[PDB]
């Protein structure tokens, strides 16, 4: 605020209050495997090379 000279209206106090909010934006990516991959990952048939 700035003090006023003669003849000019003096300025009053003010209090200004504002609010802000967040936002959301999820992301997704898939990956897929074949049943043969899942079989051969666990199972070792007869152990050959």
């Amino acid at each position: 605020r700035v003090a006023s000279g003669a003849g000019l209206p003096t300025s009053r106090q003010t209090t200004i209050m504002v609010t802000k909010y967040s936002e959301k934006s999820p992301i997704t990516i898939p990956f897929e495997l074949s049943a043969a991959c899942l079989t051969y990952l666990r199972e070792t048939f007869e152990g050959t090379i």
């Binding site: 074949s34 049943a35 043969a36 079989t39």
Partner: protein, 49 residues
């Protein structure tokens, strides 16, 4: 012949998965653009000529 009543068509190890074969003159499609999932029907229509 081994035939599948309810499931996918695949090898003993699911190492390969088979398709269903339709002779071309018997194939029907009725939309300009297909949706993701589409159901297959067999239709027999009788002409009374």
């Amino acid at each position: 012949l081994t035939c599948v009543m309810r499931g996918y068509l695949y090898n003993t190890l699911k190492t390969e998965v088979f398709a269903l074969m339709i002779p071309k003159d018997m194939y029907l499609t009725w939309e300009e653009t297909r949706g993701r999932l589409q159901y297959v029907y067999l239709i027999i229509v009788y002409d009374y000529d």
